[PDB]
């Protein structure tokens, strides 16, 4: 019987095509991020290393929560502690993450999702005291730039858009990374109420006045009427000084589909199917289903494809989302490319058979994309093989293994409580203390429903869940759902 394992680091880095050596990785962020980037890292370091701790990992602690003792604390191997307060003062200071890693030092920072992780001073930071970062260097998040300069990316490739105060504007584009420049950018946004109204008139309303530098409820208004246009123009100007403002058409009731993208360093990009994140309860995506089904597979590819040709155009490495808009009849529209892992990835991990935050690592290692067992399994070919794989028109087009459910939960020491079910075998979650994510796996569709039901089910006996999980099981059983009806309309009579 053959080894495949290995002694160390060292070498896998060696026999697996890398070119950098990563076995310290400092973690900058906490609660499910922190221990799910830890939970993910150890299997596969158990498996090539025949040691869970091969990878070292060393997390930040706010005086917060160490009081309330977390989970993945006790969990890393070594913490730090930082100062307590807003994010601005910890896990989303860039100078002090990028301070960290350096004194340790750590041989690379996982950020996940939230905080700095979209911050593209980071990996710019980082790259700059020779730590590796596990997400896409700061040259491919800046070659993307905002929602107006993606969305004009996105036009010069062809990828259709919705109507909005930029549509139309492109860049004329053996390498080198596309960029926009500063006076094409300038057209698409609009300067004062004069233009605006100009672009309204010609997008039409009901549309959204967005500022680009925007986020987090803030720097953004729906105007329905060329009437409230101007006050609502001034609002978001007031709301984010200084931010370039844009307009753009709203979606009217239409599906929302998302693409998983996962890119070596080395222009190699695979698509790991998507996800469907239609049902949302107020900005907040409450059910989501993988892979997409709702739309025929013959266009989800091709939304593939154009998902996959954007990543390689801003040079993208590691994982990111590229987010679409399907509409009922055929037609569907890019929204914007997330440069980061998402709280929801693991749906794709479990239909795919690919663990991403391991994936992340050796990827930063400089492992290609075609020496990652989990990719070659996908792909049909030989765990350990060495041989090329040809992405583009595979001999063994990858296929979904079964369908996952996933739901998100409220509440009616620790800061990830870790869910387990009697009932469901092929359904796991967990708990931040306020909301929580519970995964349903299941042959097919229906089946992974009636899992999800049986384990929201055992939930509700919970006293923290008698009553904030009864809505999701209607939901659920409902007919309407059962079906997987286009139109998502009667989520509000429910």
Known sequence: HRDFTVASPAEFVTRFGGDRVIEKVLIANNGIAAVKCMRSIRRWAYEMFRNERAIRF??????????????????????????????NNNYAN???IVDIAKRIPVQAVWAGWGH?????????????????????????????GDKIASTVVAQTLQVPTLPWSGSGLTVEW?????????????????????????????????????????????????????????ILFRQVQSE?????????????????????????????????????????????????????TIAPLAIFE?????????????????????????????SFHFLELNPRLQVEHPCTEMIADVNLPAAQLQIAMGVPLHRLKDIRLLYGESPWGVTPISFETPSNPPLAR??????????????????????????????????????????????????????????????????????????????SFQNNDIDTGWLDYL
């Open 240 to 292: 984010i000084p200084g931010s370039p403002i844009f307009l753009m058409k709203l979606a009217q009731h239409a599906r929302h589909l998302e693409v998983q993208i996962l890119a070596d360093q080395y222009g190699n990009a695979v698509s790991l199917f998507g996800r469907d994140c239609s049902i949302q309860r107020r900005h907040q995506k409450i059910v989501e289903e993988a892979p997409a």
């Open 174 to 230: 053996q390498g080198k990374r596309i960029s926009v420049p500063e006076d094409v950018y300038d057209k698409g946004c609009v300067k004062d109420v004069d233009e605006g109204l100009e672009a309204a008139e010609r997008i039409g309303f009901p549309l959204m006045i967005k500022a680009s530098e925007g986020g987090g409820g803030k720097g953004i208004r729906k105007a329905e009427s060329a009437e409230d246009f101007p």
């Open 302 to 330: 091709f939304m593939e494809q154009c998902a996959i040709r954007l990543a390689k155009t801003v040079g993208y490495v590691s994982a990111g989302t590229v987010e679409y808009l399907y509409s009922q009849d055929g």
């Open 402 to 479: 079964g369908h996952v459910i996933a739901a998100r939960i409220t509440s009616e020491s620790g800061t990830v409580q870790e869910l387990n079910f009697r009932s469901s075998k092929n359904v796991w979650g967990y708990f931040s203390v306020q909301f929580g994510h519970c995964f349903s796996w299941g042959e097919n569709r229906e089946e992974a429903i009636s899992n999800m039901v049986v384990a929201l089910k055992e939930l509700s006996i919970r006293g923290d869940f008698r009553t904030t999980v009864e809505y999701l099981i209607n939901l659920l059983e409902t007919e």
């Open 116 to 144: 700095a992780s979209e911050n593209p001073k980071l990996p710019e930071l980082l790259c700059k005291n020779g730590v590796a970062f596990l997400g896409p260097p700061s040259e491919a998040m800046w070659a993307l």
């Open 94 to 96: 860039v100078e002090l």
């Open 58 to 87: 060393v997390v930040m602690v706010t005086p917060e929560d160490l009081k309330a003792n977390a989970e993945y604390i006790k969990m890393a191997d070594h913490y730090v502690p930082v100062p307590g307060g807003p994010n």
